[PDB]
Amino acid sequence: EAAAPCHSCNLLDDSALPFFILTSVLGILASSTVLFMLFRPRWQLCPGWPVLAQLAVGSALFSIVVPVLAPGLGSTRSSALCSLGYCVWYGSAFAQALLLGCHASLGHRVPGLTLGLTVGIWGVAALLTLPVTLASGASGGLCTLIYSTELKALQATHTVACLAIFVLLPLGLFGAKGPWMNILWAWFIFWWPHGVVLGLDFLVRSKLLLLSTCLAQQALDLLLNLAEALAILHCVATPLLLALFCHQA
C-alpha cells in the first residue's frame, strides 16, 4: 500500500543529434556568420558594438561546446572534458547576462569605456563560474553538476550565483521604479526557468522543501531536463536577436 518506486531520465536520454548536435552545428554556423559579418563590413553602426559582438562570441563558444556536454556522444568522457565544457558553457551564459546588464545600465553612456567595460565583464563572468567548474564532473559517463556534502559549499555558492544572475538579476532590474525597452529580455526569459529550477532542485536535494508525492519528483526531473533543453537552445537563439538589435537602432 505504501511503496516508494520511481525513476526518470526525461525527454533527453538518447535521441541526441536530432536535437543537440544538429542544434550545436547550426548554432556554430549562425554565430560564425554573425561574427564574420561584423568583421567584414550599415553593420558597423551598432551603439556599444563590441558588447554585442562579445554577446555573439559567447554564443559561438556555447555552440562549439554544446556537443561536449550533450548526451548521445562518446561515452567515457574525461572529467576534465566535462569540467571544461561546463566552465565555458556557464561562463558564456554569465558573460552574456552580465554584458546585457551593463548595456542595460550604460546604454546611452573615455577611450577605455569599451575595453575597460568588456575586460571587467569577462573577468567577473570568469570569476562567477569558478564554483561550477570546481564543482563539476562526469560520474558514470554523463556531464553532471556535483551536488553532495563533499562539495556542499561549492554547490551552494554556484546555485546562489546562478539564481542571482539568472532570476534575481532580471527581477532585480524589475524593481526599477521610457528607456527600458530591453528587446534582449528574451535572453533572460530563456534563462529564468533554468535558474528557478536550479534553486528548486537545490532545495529538494537539501531536503528543505515540501515535495509530497512522487508526482513532485517526476515533475522536478521533467522541468530540469526541459530547462536544460531551453537553455541549450540559446546558442541558436541569440544571433537572430542580435540581428534584430542591430536593425532596431
Binding site: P5, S139, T144, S148, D201, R205, C214
Partner: protein, 59 residues
Amino acid sequence: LRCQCIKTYSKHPKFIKELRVIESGPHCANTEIVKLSDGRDPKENWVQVEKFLKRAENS
C-alpha cells in the same frame, strides 16, 4: 538525477525478491528500491538484506 525512494514507509519479509544498493552519490543527497512478490534501511531491525543474503549465501 539524485537518489530516489524518498517515501520511506513504516508498515513482507517473506515476500522480498529484488533490491539494489545505492547509498551515496555525486548527485545523491539521501539514503536508500525493493520489489515485493507480485511487483511493487540499515536502521530497521529486520530489514537490516543481510539475512536475505544468507538465504542466498552460496555466493
